[PDB]
Design a protein around this ligand. Structure first.
Ligand SMILES: [Zn+2]
Length: 256
């Protein structure tokens, strides 16, 4: 699978029939149809910068992985009773500034989206176990609006020159990804999925109402990551965003 024509979002259901399921992500959040849920607690994140581990070029994207053996780095509050353990963050982006985000709000596409992913360590013993469970994953989604250069993206963008091609990886340490989150943690939530294969309907989404900035040049740095292995013809990682999917009767709840 990929984001090509022959292997991309439109083809994904041929090998992953859950692509056409009832809890697929991302979605369009229509704000006139969201329901204020007054029992939603505020989102609490507390991450320890010492859990940052490694950055990796995964061919379709890049991941920043965190040590997840303990509860040094956790998400709590919002719709959860369970504590969730940070394991990774990554971005999605598009061909052009005009699209790029995965989630859309009242039909508006943003230019990129940051996903900060966590697994349910109160109920499960590992990511591998958690990943396929309905209440297994918690992902903060932050919409990225093209404008001012974001200095907080800094260390991440500077690390990419070490992981230019597919499979390359390098240490990436002493980083607290709560520094990338918007100042307000007001959010939408709904039950959904991973936005790429294997597309498990295991994710409770926490979508921030407030966007963060990214410059047009910052976005070019993403798209200049290569999806080929070192030595092969250069293939820019131009886009990795999936089209929005049918709510199929789910409700988007709002914290605000
Ligand atoms: Zn993602």
């Amino acid at each position: 699978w990929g984001y090509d024509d022959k292997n991309g979002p439109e083809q994904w259901s041929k090998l992953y029939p859950i692509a056409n399921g009832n809890n697929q992500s991302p979605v369009d959040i229509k704000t006139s149809e969201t329901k204020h849920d007054t029992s939603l607690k505020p989102i609490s994140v507390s991450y320890n910068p010492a859990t940052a581990k490694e950055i990796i070029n995964v061919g379709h994207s890049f991941h920043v992985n965190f040590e997840d053996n303990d509860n040094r780095s956790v998400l709590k509050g919002g719709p959860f009773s369970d504590s969730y353990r940070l394991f990774q963050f990554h971005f999605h982006w598009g061909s052009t500034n005009e699209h790029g985000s995965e989630h859309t709000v009242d039909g508006v596409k943003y230019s990129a989206e940051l996903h900060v992913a966590h697994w349910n360590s109160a109920k499960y013993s590992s990511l591998a176990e958690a990943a396929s469970k309905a209440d297994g994953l918690a992902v903060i989604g932050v919409l990225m609006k093209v404008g001012e250069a974001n200095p907080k993206l800094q260390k991440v963008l500077d690390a990419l020159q070490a992981i230019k091609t597919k499979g390359k990886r390098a240490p990436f340490t002493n980083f607290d990804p709560s520094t990338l989150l918007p100042s307000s943690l007001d959010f939408w939530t709904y039950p959904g999925s991973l936005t790429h294969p294997p597309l498990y309907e295991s994710v409770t989404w926490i979508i921030c109402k407030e966007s963060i900035s990214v410059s047009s040049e910052q976005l070019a740095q993403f798209r200049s990551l290569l999806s080929n292995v070192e030595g092969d013809n250069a293939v820019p990682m131009q886009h990795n965003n999936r089209p929005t999917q049918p709510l199929k009767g789910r409700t988007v709840r709002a914290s605000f």
